């Protein structure tokens, strides 16, 4: 926790606190990309990485990253999501948009699970920190340094869970096993995002578009 403090990981979360449903969701995604950059800049040791690696990690992670945050943001709502823009998307709007299934994958696999374990803002921050430091990402100049900071983030997160939820020996693992869902959903959202782009009837902003570009 000395090298990668859970207090500062939270501070990066708390620093960035905020008519076609899909159109809303894209605009939200665009607003949220600018912010994500600040959030990351506040994640210990992020800035210190070679500028190109910062680019790569974010080009790779932005999806699970944005989806993780709004899922946790949506625990307070009963059958929809709270978008950063201060708008709510009900699952009926989603279904009536064709995005019913993936939205339902976001309601079941992510939001509900975050609520049924009372996942806090630190555990969110730490899971987002893990997703940011992704050593698989192709193109990294030093994948090991990214892996070393992955280690630091999940060492701190485990310690935090041990210290502040001692009655839950398997909480730490329950958080980490939310990542296949995240990754899996993140890929489905991206597949949709490409369709919305392919098909030309969804307003996509510059940052979202830039992200939707081939390397």
């Amino acid at each position: 926790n000395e090298d990668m403090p859970v207090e500062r990981i939270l501070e990066a979360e708390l620093a960035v606190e905020p008519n076609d449903p899909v159109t809303n969701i894209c605009q939200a995604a665009d607003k949220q990309l600018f912010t994500l950059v600040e959030w990351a800049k506040r994640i210990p040791h992020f800035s210190e990485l070679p500028l190109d690696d910062q680019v790569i990690l974010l080009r790779a992670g932005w999806n699970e990253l944005l989806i993780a945050s709004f899922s946790h943001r949506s625990i307070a709502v009963k059958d929809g999501i709270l978008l950063a823009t201060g708008l709510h998307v009900h699952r009926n709007s989603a279904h009536s948009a064709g995005v019913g299934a993936i939205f339902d994958r976001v309601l079941t696999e992510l939001v509900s699970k975050m609520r049924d374990m009372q996942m806090d803002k630190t555990e969110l921050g730490c899971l987002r920190a893990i997703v940011l430091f992704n050593p698989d990402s192709k193109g990294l100049s030093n994948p090991a340094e990214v892996e070393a900071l992955r280690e630091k983030v999940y060492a701190s997160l485990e310690a935090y869970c041990k210290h502040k939820y001692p009655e839950q020996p398997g909480r730490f693992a329950k958080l980490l096993l939310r990542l296949p869902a995240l990754r899996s959903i993140g890929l489905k959202c991206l597949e949709h995002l490409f369709f919305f782009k392919l098909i030309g009837d969804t307003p996509i902003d510059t940052f979202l578009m830039e992200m939707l570009e081939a390397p």
Partner: peptide, 10 residues
């Protein structure tokens, strides 16, 4: 990637 690089720098 114009925006990302700009937003990361300052």
């Amino acid at each position: 990637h114009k925006i990302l690089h700009r937003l990361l720098q300052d």
